[model samples]
Target: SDVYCEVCEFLVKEVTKLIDNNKTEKEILDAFDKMCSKLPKSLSEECQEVVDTYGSSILSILLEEVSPELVCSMLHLCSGLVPR
Candidate 1:
């Protein structure tokens, strides 16, 4: 669960970079695959399904300027951190 949560958390950082690079809208799904491709070898397959299913909804939250840790917390992946 830790690694999976980290994967979810990491996506928040990865996706934030894209948004930082001016990717406000469109092609987010493909960009997500690009990010997933850079995942650790062991986590790749696992992250595949996680991202495949919930990528869009998460991205929606992310683009709203939500914090990275908050993203994971919001997804119920990391109960350790919560946004006020």
Candidate 2:
């Protein structure tokens, strides 16, 4: 469930930030989270056991790697809207 945990955290943070900025409603984000959480993840049967065991740590590492890029891109994209 590490993969799910990381995915949930990632979505919640971004959604909270967007809601704070008045960009989207909290419910919208919540719905998105629900939708994302329900998506089926495919894993090889051989790896399924390890995934069930070490999946959380594995997800943490994957999320940490990608989250910064997502944050930076979102912030940078927002900056472009400022009047010079």
Candidate 3:
């Protein structure tokens, strides 16, 4: 099966844009949660693994490396989702 590159691109662009916008953690997480609503059920297993691996304090990890703007963007990307 093929992954939806268009959706991935859209997500990446949106995440980058959110970073550029300098959003807050809450905002970013909210956005992410909202976006997750559209996630494919078929990928639930993979998604679980993603959460298991990267889910551990991802915000704190990103804050250490990425700029505040990027952190904000990340937050926006993850807004709607909870930590795995």
Candidate 4:
């Protein structure tokens, strides 16, 4: 539970910072990939669950504000998270 919450908070804080600063989609994707790569497997899995549950709504908002090219890049990152 603690691990899940910790990872979720970390994810939220990081993404929020990116959004608030108006970081480019590529920048956001890079940060996300780096963060996910550095996380422990358990924490990463927990983060994935958190993303699956809450990421879509936030990302939809982001998509409305971001460029199409950036949307494509973000979509690629998201597709990787889903099972085939």
* Winner by lDDT: 1
In candidate 1, which residue ranges exceed 4 Å CA deviation? 81-84
lDDT per residue as tens, model 4, 1-84: 346445545665567667888887667656655667767775767666656665654456555766433443354433334566
Candidate 3 global CA lDDT score: 0.51
The TM-scores of all predictions, comma-separated, are 0.79, 0.30, 0.41, 0.47
Model 4, residue pairs in steric clash: none
Candidate 2 lDDT, 1-84, residue by residue in tens: 434334434544654465456653435434543444443455233234433453344334433545534542343322334577
Question: Higher TM-score: candidate 1 or 3?
Answer: 1
lDDT of 2 at 12: 44
Alpha-carbon shift of residue 70 in model 1 (angstroms): 0.8
Candidate 3 off by > 4 Å: 1-16, 48-56, 66-84
Best by TM-score: 1
- What does candidate 3 score on TM? 0.41
Which is the better candidate, 2 or 4, if ranked by TM-score? 4
**Which 10 residues in a row give candidate 2 its minimum summed lDDT?**
71-80
